[PDB]
């Protein structure tokens, strides 16, 4: 029901991240959130690979994935 949104943002990432490394770092970040289940670790690493206007779209992009609860805590941790 909301799979297109993932591939849509993910697709945007590839467009804004031609390199493979940036993608490698992002992969580790996503795997961390799934394993650790902590949005605090995601915010930190996220900025590292999303500290640029061009990379910013990833911060807001991945968010939608995060559950409502983690969304509130995630949004709080983020500059907004």
């Amino acid at each position: 029901m909301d799979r297109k949104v993932a591939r849509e943002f993910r697709h945007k990432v590839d467009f804004l991240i031609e390199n493979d490394a940036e993608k490698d770092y992002l992969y580790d970040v996503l795997r961390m959130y799934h394993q650790t289940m902590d949005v605090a670790v995601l915010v930190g690493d996220l900025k590292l690979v999303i500290n640029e206007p061009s990379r910013l779209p990833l911060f807001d992009a991945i968010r939608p994935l995060i559950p409502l609860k983690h969304q509130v805590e995630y949004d709080q941790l983020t500059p907004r």
């Binding site: 909301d2 943002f9 590839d14 992969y27």
Partner: peptide
């Protein structure tokens, strides 16, 4: 439905 997991699988598949 685990959206995060969906994106991870999407990438792994987009790799090949």
């Amino acid at each position: 439905g685990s959206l995060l997991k969906e994106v991870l699988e999407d990438y792994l598949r987009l790799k090949k």
